[PDB]
Motif scaffolding. Structure first.
Motif, PDB file in Angstrom:
ATOM      1  N   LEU A  24       0.791  -1.237  -0.168  1.00 40.16           N
ATOM      2  CA  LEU A  24      -0.097   0.082   0.036  1.00 40.16           C
ATOM      3  C   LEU A  24       0.965   1.367  -0.055  1.00 40.16           C
ATOM      4  N   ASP A  25       0.922   1.924  -1.140  1.00 40.67           N
ATOM      5  CA  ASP A  25       1.726   3.068  -1.117  1.00 40.67           C
ATOM      6  C   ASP A  25       1.208   4.528  -1.386  1.00 40.67           C
ATOM      7  N   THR A  26       1.204   5.468  -0.527  1.00 41.19           N
ATOM      8  CA  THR A  26       0.569   6.545  -0.530  1.00 41.19           C
ATOM      9  C   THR A  26       1.406   7.723  -1.286  1.00 41.19           C
ATOM     10  N   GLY A  27       2.665   7.182  -1.507  1.00 40.84           N
ATOM     11  CA  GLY A  27       3.629   8.035  -2.480  1.00 40.84           C
ATOM     12  C   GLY A  27       3.598   7.688  -3.774  1.00 40.84           C
ATOM     13  N   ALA A  28       2.676   6.786  -4.162  1.00 45.32           N
ATOM     14  CA  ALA A  28       2.478   6.496  -5.785  1.00 45.32           C
ATOM     15  C   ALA A  28       1.114   6.760  -6.235  1.00 45.32           C
ATOM     16  N   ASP A  29       1.133   7.379  -7.326  1.00 43.79           N
ATOM     17  CA  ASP A  29      -0.145   7.905  -8.154  1.00 43.79           C
ATOM     18  C   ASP A  29      -0.640   6.747  -8.596  1.00 43.79           C
ATOM     19  N   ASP A  30      -0.016   5.896  -8.969  1.00 41.43           N
ATOM     20  CA  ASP A  30      -0.568   4.924  -9.612  1.00 41.43           C
ATOM     21  C   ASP A  30      -0.255   3.312  -9.170  1.00 41.43           C
ATOM     22  N   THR A  31      -0.931   2.251  -9.553  1.00 38.77           N
ATOM     23  CA  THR A  31      -0.763   1.096  -9.164  1.00 38.77           C
ATOM     24  C   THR A  31       0.053   0.039 -10.427  1.00 38.77           C
ATOM     25  N   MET A  46       4.504   6.274 -19.281  1.00 35.13           N
ATOM     26  CA  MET A  46       5.831   6.370 -18.544  1.00 35.13           C
ATOM     27  C   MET A  46       5.632   6.747 -17.177  1.00 35.13           C
ATOM     28  N   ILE A  47       6.184   5.915 -16.351  1.00 32.81           N
ATOM     29  CA  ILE A  47       6.168   6.498 -15.058  1.00 32.81           C
ATOM     30  C   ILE A  47       7.724   6.602 -14.337  1.00 32.81           C
ATOM     31  N   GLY A  48       7.647   7.519 -13.370  1.00 37.21           N
ATOM     32  CA  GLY A  48       8.961   7.790 -12.708  1.00 37.21           C
ATOM     33  C   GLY A  48       9.113   7.293 -11.262  1.00 37.21           C
ATOM     34  N   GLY A  49      10.201   7.035 -10.816  1.00 36.36           N
ATOM     35  CA  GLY A  49      10.460   6.841  -9.393  1.00 36.36           C
ATOM     36  C   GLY A  49      11.529   7.372  -9.045  1.00 36.36           C
TER      37      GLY A  49
ATOM     38  N   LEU B  24       4.383  12.217   1.984  1.00 35.70           N
ATOM     39  CA  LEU B  24       4.224  11.000   2.905  1.00 35.70           C
ATOM     40  C   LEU B  24       4.233   9.738   2.062  1.00 35.70           C
ATOM     41  N   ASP B  25       5.108   9.062   2.294  1.00 34.20           N
ATOM     42  CA  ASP B  25       5.151   7.700   1.405  1.00 34.20           C
ATOM     43  C   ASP B  25       5.366   6.521   2.011  1.00 34.20           C
ATOM     44  N   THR B  26       4.114   5.809   2.381  1.00 37.31           N
ATOM     45  CA  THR B  26       3.977   4.314   2.851  1.00 37.31           C
ATOM     46  C   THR B  26       4.728   3.545   2.262  1.00 37.31           C
ATOM     47  N   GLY B  27       5.287   3.641   1.056  1.00 36.60           N
ATOM     48  CA  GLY B  27       5.812   2.493   0.287  1.00 36.60           C
ATOM     49  C   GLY B  27       7.513   3.050   0.283  1.00 36.60           C
ATOM     50  N   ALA B  28       7.742   3.962   1.269  1.00 34.80           N
ATOM     51  CA  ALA B  28       9.342   4.182   1.269  1.00 34.80           C
ATOM     52  C   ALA B  28       9.828   3.763   2.844  1.00 34.80           C
ATOM     53  N   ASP B  29      10.769   2.882   2.865  1.00 38.29           N
ATOM     54  CA  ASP B  29      11.455   2.562   3.979  1.00 38.29           C
ATOM     55  C   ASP B  29      12.128   3.604   4.631  1.00 38.29           C
ATOM     56  N   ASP B  30      12.726   4.460   4.125  1.00 38.90           N
ATOM     57  CA  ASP B  30      13.315   5.507   4.625  1.00 38.90           C
ATOM     58  C   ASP B  30      13.023   7.043   4.161  1.00 38.90           C
ATOM     59  N   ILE B  47      20.041   3.404  -2.604  1.00 37.49           N
ATOM     60  CA  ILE B  47      18.420   3.040  -2.591  1.00 37.49           C
ATOM     61  C   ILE B  47      17.962   2.776  -3.831  1.00 37.49           C
ATOM     62  N   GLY B  48      17.083   2.001  -3.988  1.00 37.94           N
ATOM     63  CA  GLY B  48      16.418   1.592  -5.210  1.00 37.94           C
ATOM     64  C   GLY B  48      14.789   1.809  -5.312  1.00 37.94           C
ATOM     65  N   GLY B  49      14.100   1.805  -6.417  1.00 41.36           N
ATOM     66  CA  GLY B  49      12.613   1.963  -6.653  1.00 41.36           C
ATOM     67  C   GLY B  49      12.349   1.973  -8.040  1.00 41.36           C
TER      68      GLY B  49
HETATM   69  C1  LIG Z   1       8.956   0.611  -6.228  1.00 45.15           C
HETATM   70  C2  LIG Z   1       9.634   0.516  -4.804  1.00 45.15           C
HETATM   71  C3  LIG Z   1       8.626   0.872  -3.731  1.00 45.15           C
HETATM   72  C4  LIG Z   1       7.685   1.937  -3.660  1.00 45.15           C
HETATM   73  C5  LIG Z   1       8.527   3.257  -3.914  1.00 45.15           C
HETATM   74  C6  LIG Z   1       7.728   4.303  -4.127  1.00 45.15           C
HETATM   75  N1  LIG Z   1       8.352   5.494  -4.043  1.00 45.15           N
HETATM   76  C7  LIG Z   1       7.754   6.579  -4.572  1.00 45.15           C
HETATM   77  C8  LIG Z   1       8.617   7.924  -4.417  1.00 45.15           C
HETATM   78  C9  LIG Z   1       7.845   9.092  -5.085  1.00 45.15           C
HETATM   79  C10 LIG Z   1       8.717   9.488  -6.387  1.00 45.15           C
HETATM   80  C11 LIG Z   1      10.298   9.569  -6.362  1.00 45.15           C
HETATM   81  C12 LIG Z   1       7.573   6.564  -6.099  1.00 45.15           C
HETATM   82  O1  LIG Z   1       8.405   6.061  -6.815  1.00 45.15           O
HETATM   83  N2  LIG Z   1       6.325   6.739  -6.832  1.00 45.15           N
HETATM   84  C13 LIG Z   1       6.077   6.622  -8.261  1.00 45.15           C
HETATM   85  C14 LIG Z   1       5.378   5.386  -8.363  1.00 45.15           C
HETATM   86  C15 LIG Z   1       5.077   5.046  -9.780  1.00 45.15           C
HETATM   87  C16 LIG Z   1       3.450   5.308 -10.126  1.00 45.15           C
HETATM   88  N3  LIG Z   1       3.532   5.521 -11.555  1.00 45.15           N
HETATM   89  O2  LIG Z   1       2.599   5.797  -9.259  1.00 45.15           O
HETATM   90  C17 LIG Z   1       5.128   8.029  -8.546  1.00 45.15           C
HETATM   91  O3  LIG Z   1       4.299   8.291  -7.810  1.00 45.15           O
HETATM   92  N4  LIG Z   1       5.517   8.202  -9.865  1.00 45.15           N
HETATM   93  C18 LIG Z   1       4.624   9.289 -10.521  1.00 45.15           C
HETATM   94  C19 LIG Z   1       5.675  10.511 -10.648  1.00 45.15           C
HETATM   95  C20 LIG Z   1       5.784  11.453  -9.193  1.00 45.15           C
HETATM   96  C21 LIG Z   1       6.449  12.500  -9.548  1.00 45.15           C
HETATM   97  N5  LIG Z   1       6.458  13.399  -8.141  1.00 45.15           N
HETATM   98  C22 LIG Z   1       6.979  14.710  -8.354  1.00 45.15           C
HETATM   99  N6  LIG Z   1       7.647  15.196  -9.539  1.00 45.15           N
HETATM  100  N7  LIG Z   1       6.773  15.461  -7.356  1.00 45.15           N
HETATM  101  C23 LIG Z   1       4.116   8.936 -11.786  1.00 45.15           C
HETATM  102  N8  LIG Z   1       3.144   9.121 -12.245  1.00 45.15           N
HETATM  103  O4  LIG Z   1       4.899   8.282 -12.703  1.00 45.15           O
HETATM  104  N9  LIG Z   1       9.634   3.230  -2.559  1.00 45.15           N
HETATM  105  C24 LIG Z   1      10.767   3.594  -2.967  1.00 45.15           C
HETATM  106  O5  LIG Z   1      11.147   4.102  -4.076  1.00 45.15           O
HETATM  107  C25 LIG Z   1      11.653   3.719  -1.517  1.00 45.15           C
HETATM  108  N10 LIG Z   1      12.432   2.473  -1.384  1.00 45.15           N
HETATM  109  C26 LIG Z   1      12.286   1.661  -0.684  1.00 45.15           C
HETATM  110  O6  LIG Z   1      11.441   1.820   0.045  1.00 45.15           O
HETATM  111  C27 LIG Z   1      13.305   0.310  -0.676  1.00 45.15           C
HETATM  112  N11 LIG Z   1      13.185  -0.197  -1.855  1.00 45.15           N
HETATM  113  C28 LIG Z   1      12.524  -1.246  -2.379  1.00 45.15           C
HETATM  114  C29 LIG Z   1      12.559  -1.674  -3.633  1.00 45.15           C
HETATM  115  O7  LIG Z   1      11.501  -1.819  -1.567  1.00 45.15           O
HETATM  116  C30 LIG Z   1      14.371   0.790   0.151  1.00 45.15           C
HETATM  117  C31 LIG Z   1      15.244  -0.498   0.518  1.00 45.15           C
HETATM  118  O8  LIG Z   1      15.425   1.343  -0.767  1.00 45.15           O
HETATM  119  C32 LIG Z   1      12.716   4.806  -1.860  1.00 45.15           C
HETATM  120  C33 LIG Z   1      12.001   6.207  -1.666  1.00 45.15           C
HETATM  121  C34 LIG Z   1      14.107   4.633  -0.931  1.00 45.15           C
HETATM  122  C35 LIG Z   1      13.503   4.580   0.411  1.00 45.15           C
END
Ligand SMILES: CCCC[C@@H](CN[C@@H](CCCC)C(=O)N[C@@H](CCC(N)=O)C(=O)N[C@@H](CCCNC(N)=[NH2+])C(N)=O)NC(=O)[C@@H](NC(=O)[C@@H](NC(C)=O)[C@@H](C)O)[C@@H](C)CC
Lengths: 99, 99
Positions: A24-31, A46-49, B24-30, B47-49
């Motif tokens: 469950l990811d509040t930091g993700a716009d999409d699934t 295209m999605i970004g992380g 606020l990212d519940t999908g982020a460990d750190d 760190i990855g994602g």
């Molecule tokens: C996939 C890995 C698990 C979920 C992920 C979600 N992170 C958010 C962070 C916000 C962006 C940097 C994210 O990627 N969100 C994306 C998810 C993809 C999606 N489409 O929903 C998102 O909302 N992307 C938007 C764009 C956001 C841009 N925002 C902005 N410009 N302000 C999008 N539509 O593509 N968590 C992580 O990336 C974190 N990683 C972790 O928690 C651990 N890694 C793993 C693989 O578990 C740790 C051991 O590294 C990072 C932050 C380090 C602690």
């Protein structure tokens, strides 16, 4: 339910008749779900992380159960490190963040 | 407060005496913050994602003010595109997912 965050908020989801674990990811716009077979046609997206951008396959109106709550909407399929349930579907199951 | 997920759950934090907008990212460990200076010793971390990995600097016992609360813990600093508040600090303010 009320889920604390001492551990990763992982839940069981059912998609395509299969049970999978998702975050469950509040930091993700999409699934975004790992590579799998879904019915119908898909469109590009295209999605970004944290590490950058990736191309995924967008399927619309997919029936997916999230922790026992049924949702029907967009599911992105691609090279994601972990299955994540984004805000699009979290809103459908009535999830809120509280403190 | 109860935060709905119709839009990105953004908050203003104060770290290193600086006010920053964070997710606020519940999908982020750190907790990962954009490049900034923090006191004390640090250690490199990867760190990855979505998109891959980025190299960050790990600082321990850093106090961050978030939503009136003054939490303390590890903060990673690096080339992140968004300031992210992870579970490490969300637990401290008693944040939970509810549905
Ligand atoms: C996939 C890995 C698990 C979920 C992920 C979600 N992170 C958010 C962070 C916000 C962006 C940097 C994210 O990627 N969100 C994306 C998810 C993809 C999606 N489409 O929903 C998102 O909302 N992307 C938007 C764009 C956001 C841009 N925002 C902005 N410009 N302000 C999008 N539509 O593509 N968590 C992580 O990336 C974190 N990683 C972790 O928690 C651990 N890694 C793993 C693989 O578990 C740790 C051991 O590294 C990072 C932050 C380090 C602690």
């Amino acid at each position: 339910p009320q889920i604390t965050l001492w551990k990763r908020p992982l839940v069981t989801i059912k998609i395509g008749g299969q049970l999978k674990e998702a975050l469950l990811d509040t930091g993700a716009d999409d699934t975004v779900i790992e590579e799998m077979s879904l019915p119908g046609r898909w469109k590009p997206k295209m999605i970004g992380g944290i590490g950058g951008f990736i191309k995924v396959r967008q399927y619309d109106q997919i029936i997916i159960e999230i922790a026992g709550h049924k949702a029907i909407g967009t599911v992105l399929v691609g090279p994601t490190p972990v299955n994540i349930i984004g805000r699009d579907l979290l809103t459908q199951i009535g999830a809120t963040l509280n403190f």
